């Protein structure tokens, strides 16, 4: 399946399929040089699937998204007397994509950029143009909006994901379903009903694709997060925090924030959200359970963005600790 952005100009394809890795060669030709920036671990796993093109091994996961690693990689690459017709190919998860993407965005004011996502959670991150690094202050505080030349998503990369990464990635697949509606949420809940099915990845393809289409509507609609793209931050308000203190996986935190979010909506609008229902769903999936802006779902199809006071968040956290 090939998806494609529909902006008034400068659009990119999104190849989602088992074996899409092939499509990378078709591009590589039209580039002077190509820098294969690949994750430390990811390189171990697929160094062979890849062996004018240079491989740059960067730290694992979030370890590379530092301002320091940003200077070193740009410098190292710059030393290779590059040109504006150079491409940065990002092989790895969301962390490498963001980092490599920020290098590609700032190198010579912007060079060519190929996204090669290898995680479930990367179905979300490789789409939309958000790239960047973290700051000693907080998460993705420094970055840019920069459209890749193409997104090449090969589903076979997913076969080697520990369950920990499956769970983490699922949170985003599930967030999109939530944002996509009540019918898509009950649809995905019934399929991925337990840890076993989830861990097997059976049918994740369809849901991943569905997830990309959902976001592809929102980001083409509101590219710079000036309107509806803020709905994508569902459960990231409380998620982004929890993550930075307990350093759990990104997706694990989102789920906790998605629960939290439901609790808050119940306080304000009294949505009558079966919190007990969502909690049990996380338990069945195998999730280890151990005015501030905010994207709140008042009802499926009625997503809102508004401030919330400490007292409401204080009470929303009280309720959550119940579980
Ligand atoms: N719009 C956006 O740009 C956006 C949206 C969502 C999340 N994010 C960012 O993305 C990151 C989270 O995504 P992530 O989970 O992919 O991060 P990640 O890069 O850290 O990948 C998770 C782990 O999986 C390993 N891994 C990668 N591919 C693998 C594979 N096929 N087999 C086995 N192990 C593999 C990595 O080495 C890493 O240890 C965060 O840094 C977050 O801030 C950005
Ligand atoms: Zn996210």
Curated annotation (Swiss-Prot):
<keyword id="KW-0479">Metal-binding</keyword>
<keyword id="KW-0963">Cytoplasm</keyword>
<feature type="binding site">
    <location>
        <begin position="157"/>
        <end position="160"/>
    </location>
    <ligand>
        <name>NAD(+)</name>
    </ligand>
</feature>
<feature type="binding site">
    <location>
        <position position="130"/>
    </location>
    <ligand>
        <name>NAD(+)</name>
    </ligand>
</feature>
<feature type="binding site">
    <location>
        <begin position="94"/>
        <end position="98"/>
    </location>
    <ligand>
        <name>NAD(+)</name>
    </ligand>
</feature>
<dbReference type="GO" id="GO:0046872">
    <property type="term" value="F:metal ion binding"/>
</dbReference>
<keyword id="KW-0520">NAD</keyword>
<dbReference type="Pfam" id="PF01761">
    <property type="entry name" value="DHQ_synthase"/>
</dbReference>
<dbReference type="InterPro" id="IPR056179">
    <property type="entry name" value="DHQS_C"/>
</dbReference>
<dbReference type="Pfam" id="PF24621">
    <property type="entry name" value="DHQS_C"/>
</dbReference>
<feature type="binding site">
    <location>
        <position position="45"/>
    </location>
    <ligand>
        <name>NAD(+)</name>
    </ligand>
</feature>
<keyword id="KW-0057">Aromatic amino acid biosynthesis</keyword>
<keyword id="KW-0862">Zinc</keyword>
<dbReference type="GO" id="GO:0005737">
    <property type="term" value="C:cytoplasm"/>
</dbReference>
<feature type="binding site">
    <location>
        <position position="172"/>
    </location>
    <ligand>
        <name>Zn(2+)</name>
    </ligand>
</feature>
<keyword id="KW-0170">Cobalt</keyword>
<dbReference type="InterPro" id="IPR050071">
    <property type="entry name" value="Dehydroquinate_synthase"/>
</dbReference>
<feature type="binding site">
    <location>
        <position position="236"/>
    </location>
    <ligand>
        <name>Zn(2+)</name>
    </ligand>
</feature>
<dbReference type="InterPro" id="IPR030963">
    <property type="entry name" value="DHQ_synth_fam"/>
</dbReference>
<dbReference type="GO" id="GO:0008652">
    <property type="term" value="P:amino acid biosynthetic process"/>
</dbReference>
<protein>
    <recommendedName>
        <fullName>3-dehydroquinate synthase</fullName>
        <ecNumber>4.2.3.4</ecNumber>
    </recommendedName>
</protein>
<feature type="binding site">
    <location>
        <position position="39"/>
    </location>
    <ligand>
        <name>NAD(+)</name>
    </ligand>
</feature>
<dbReference type="InterPro" id="IPR016037">
    <property type="entry name" value="DHQ_synth_AroB"/>
</dbReference>
<keyword id="KW-0547">Nucleotide-binding</keyword>
<dbReference type="GO" id="GO:0009423">
    <property type="term" value="P:chorismate biosynthetic process"/>
</dbReference>
<dbReference type="GO" id="GO:0003856">
    <property type="term" value="F:3-dehydroquinate synthase activity"/>
</dbReference>
<feature type="binding site">
    <location>
        <begin position="62"/>
        <end position="65"/>
    </location>
    <ligand>
        <name>NAD(+)</name>
    </ligand>
</feature>
<comment type="function">
    <text>Catalyzes the conversion of 3-deoxy-D-arabino-heptulosonate 7-phosphate (DAHP) to dehydroquinate (DHQ).</text>
</comment>
<dbReference type="InterPro" id="IPR030960">
    <property type="entry name" value="DHQS/DOIS_N"/>
</dbReference>
<feature type="binding site">
    <location>
        <begin position="118"/>
        <end position="119"/>
    </location>
    <ligand>
        <name>NAD(+)</name>
    </ligand>
</feature>
<comment type="pathway">
    <text>Metabolic intermediate biosynthesis; chorismate biosynthesis; chorismate from D-erythrose 4-phosphate and phosphoenolpyruvate: step 2/7.</text>
</comment>
<keyword id="KW-0028">Amino-acid biosynthesis</keyword>
<keyword id="KW-0456">Lyase</keyword>
<dbReference type="GO" id="GO:0009073">
    <property type="term" value="P:aromatic amino acid family biosynthetic process"/>
</dbReference>
<feature type="binding site">
    <location>
        <position position="250"/>
    </location>
    <ligand>
        <name>Zn(2+)</name>
    </ligand>
</feature>
<dbReference type="GO" id="GO:0000166">
    <property type="term" value="F:nucleotide binding"/>
</dbReference>
<feature type="binding site">
    <location>
        <position position="139"/>
    </location>
    <ligand>
        <name>NAD(+)</name>
    </ligand>
</feature>
<comment type="similarity">
    <text>Belongs to the sugar phosphate cyclases superfamily. Dehydroquinate synthase family.</text>
</comment>
């Amino acid at each position: 399946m090939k998806l494609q952005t529909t902006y008034p100009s400068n659009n990119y394809p999104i190849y989602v399929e088992h074996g899409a890795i092939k499509y990378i060669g078709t591009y590589l030709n039209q580039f002077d040089q190509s820098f294969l920036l690949i994750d430390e671990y990811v390189n171990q796993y697929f160094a062979n699937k890849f062996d004018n093109v240079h491989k740059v091994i960067i730290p694992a996961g979030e370890k590379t998204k530092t301002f320091e690693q940003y200077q070193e990689t740009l410098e190292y690459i710059l030393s290779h007397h590059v040109t504006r017709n150079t491409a940065i190919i990002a092989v790895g998860g969301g962390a490498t994509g963001d980092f490599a993407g920020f290098v590609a965005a700032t190198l010579l004011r912007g060079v060519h950029f190929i996204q090669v996502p290898t995680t479930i959670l990367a179905h979300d991150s490789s789409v939309g143009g958000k790239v960047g690094i973290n700051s000693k202050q907080g998460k993705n505080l420094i970055g840019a909006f920069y459209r890749p030349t193409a997104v090449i998503y090969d589903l076979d990369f997913l076969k080697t994901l520990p369950f920990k990464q499956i769970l983490s990635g699922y949170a985003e697949v599930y967030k999109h379903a939530l944002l996509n509606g009540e019918s898509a949420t009950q649809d995905i809940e019934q399929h991925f009903k337990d840890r076993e099915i989830l861990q097997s990845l059976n049918g994740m393809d369809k849901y991943i694709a569905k997830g990309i289409e959902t976001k592809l509507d929102i980001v083409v609609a509101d590219e710079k997060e000036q309107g509806v793209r803020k709905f994508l931050n569902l459960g990231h308000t409380f998620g982004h925090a929890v993550e930075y203190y307990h350093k759990i996986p990104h997706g694990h935190a989102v789920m906790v924030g998605i629960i939290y979010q439901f609790i808050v909506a119940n306080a304000l609008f009294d949505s009558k959200h079966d919190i007990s229902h969502y909690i049990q769903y996380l338990i069945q999936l195998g999730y280890p359970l151990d005015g501030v802006q905010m994207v709140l779902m008042r009802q499926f199809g009625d997503i809102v963005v508004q401030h919330v006071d400490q007292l409401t968040l204080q009470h929303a956290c009280e309720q959550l600790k119940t579980y």
